């Protein structure tokens, strides 16, 4: 399901860019929300919540806590 994984990545990158008012381009796998995307602690929690809704999933609090770069969330949703 490589194409499916690619579509999922596209969707996640869209959601992040929309919530942080950033261009999808800036949403790189190695993208730290606070330094590279201009997000803070409030933006982070609401972003994680939009993902859960956009993808009908539930990120447990421990994994959400370790999220530093876009690729962390990307992997989590890949192994979903």
């Amino acid at each position: 399901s490589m194409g499916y994984l690619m579509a999922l990545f596209e969707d996640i990158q869209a959601v992040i860019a929309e919530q942080l008012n950033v261009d999808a381009a800036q949403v790189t796998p190695e993208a730290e929300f606070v330094k590279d995307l201009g997000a803070d602690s409030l933006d982070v929690v609401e972003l994680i919540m939009a993902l859960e809704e956009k993808f009908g999933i539930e990120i447990p609090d421990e994994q959400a806590e370790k999220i530093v770069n876009v690729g962390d969330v990307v992997k989590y949703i890949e192994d979903n």
Partner: protein, 412 residues
């Protein structure tokens, strides 16, 4: 003691996005009341409101932050941006200069703030659990986030105060800023009243106490202060803002001077939770203290005048009692016919209107005057604006809980 002047102003309401458009429309007797479209009111007993339909939040704040502010805060940012720019205080980055920032605070007023945001998140929680509560909920809804968001937008770090005295919140926010400056707690204060509660539970809350007009078939004729066929207020949304400044500091800056604060009065009825005191006695006392502090001749009164039976009656009685007789009452008008009664924001909006009326020698009229009310027999500037120069203006505000506030501003 310390003298305080108005050096910048801004306002947004259902008849304009800034004070020049809005006041012009108000003075010509236009009306911004329309059929409610911001939610589905098809099944409601009240389906009219002073909705602002041409407001785009994206023009006042970054889209990312828009979801972080209740509509009332969005309107406050529009009004204060206009007033701060109007004042000439701001530097090249639209900030308060760093060396003035600690002595410029903010005094904000609202009755309930982000009601629609509490309503929406209350329902999320009830339907799908606390996981569906939006994290931006609290800080989008708290009344004092007006001062929170505005102080951050402008870099102003003085006293950060917020009044929540119901329909008199806008006026109490002025008075608390005046008091702060009088006691040397600040040299400058941004004042802003803001309210936006055109939402199902807000309209429903006022209709269940039968305080709203149900003239749903003619929205532009439903709000009619002091008229015999009035039958309840029409809810408006909006925000007004003023920059107050100690006089010497204003002159030294080269500020423009709209008006000089002259007096205020504050009282409580201690009578009923929604109805006014008999004979508007608490209003009488607030107006009396303001008049005796100001020691000027008031040439125009912007009345609270919400278009309910009780408020227009007892305000007229109190006015007549405080000036001495009917002939001794200055020209009075309520602009709630034009823009609806905007609750918490009303006192702030109506101070801007009152000052502009004095600046321009144009007294805006009380519209929809069609049937004299024998009990309401003052000079309400009926139907059309009165070209008359005045030297001072008084604005009244009263709220649930019997809380009253009055302010007088005099010519510069």
């Amino acid at each position: 003691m310390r003298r305080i002047v108005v050096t910048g102003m801004g306002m947004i309401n259902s008849l304009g996005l800034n004070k020049e458009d809005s006041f012009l429309a108000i003075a010509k007797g236009e009306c911004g009341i329309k059929h409610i479209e911001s939610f589905d009111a098809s099944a409601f007993p009240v389906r009219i409101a002073g909705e602002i339909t041409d407001f785009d939040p994206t023009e006042v704040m970054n889209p990312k932050d828009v979801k972080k502010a209740g509509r009332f805060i969005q309107l406050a940012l529009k009004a204060t941006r206009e007033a701060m720019k109007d004042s000439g205080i701001l530097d090249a980055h639209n900030r308060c200069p760093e060396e003035l920032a600690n002595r410029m605070g903010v005094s904000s007023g609202s009755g309930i703030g982000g009601l629609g945001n509490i309503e929406a998140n209350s329902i999320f929680c009830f339907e799908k659990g606390p996981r569906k509560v939006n994290p931006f909920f609290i800080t989008s809804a708290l009344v004092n986030m007006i001062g929170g968001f505005t102080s951050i937008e402008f870099g102003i770090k003085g006293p950060n105060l917020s009044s929540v005295t119901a329909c008199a919140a806008g006026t109490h926010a002025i008075i608390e800023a005046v008091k702060t400056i009088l006691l040397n707690g600040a040299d400058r204060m941004l004042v802003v009243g803001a309210e936006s509660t055109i939402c199902p539970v807000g309209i429903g809350g006022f209709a269940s106490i039968k305080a709203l007009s149900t003239r749903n078939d003619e929205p532009k004729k439903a709000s009619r202060p002091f008229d015999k066929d009035r039958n309840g207020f029409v809810m408006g949304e909006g925000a007004g803002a003023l920059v107050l400044e100690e006089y010497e500091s204003a002159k030294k800056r080269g500020a423009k001077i709209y008006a000089e604060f002259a007096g205020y009065g504050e009282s409580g009825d201690a009578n009923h939770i929604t109805a006014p005191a008999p004979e508007g006695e608490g209003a009488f006392r607030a107006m009396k203290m303001a008049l005796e502090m100001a020691k000027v001749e008031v040439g125009y009164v912007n009345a609270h005048g919400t278009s309910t039976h009780y408020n227009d009656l007892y305000e007229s009685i109190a006015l007549k009692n405080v000036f001495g007789s009917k002939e001794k009452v200055p020209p009075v008008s309520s602009t709630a016919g034009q823009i609806g009664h905007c609750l918490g924001a009303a006192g702030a909006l109506e101070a801007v209107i009152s000052i502009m009326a004095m600046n321009q020698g144009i007294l805006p009229p009380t519209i929809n005057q069609e049937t004299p009310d024998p009990e309401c027999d003052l000079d309400y500037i009926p139907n059309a604006a009165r070209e008359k120069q005045v030297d001072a203006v008084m604005s009244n505000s009263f709220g649930f809980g019997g809380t009253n506030g009055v302010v007088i501003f005099k010519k510069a």
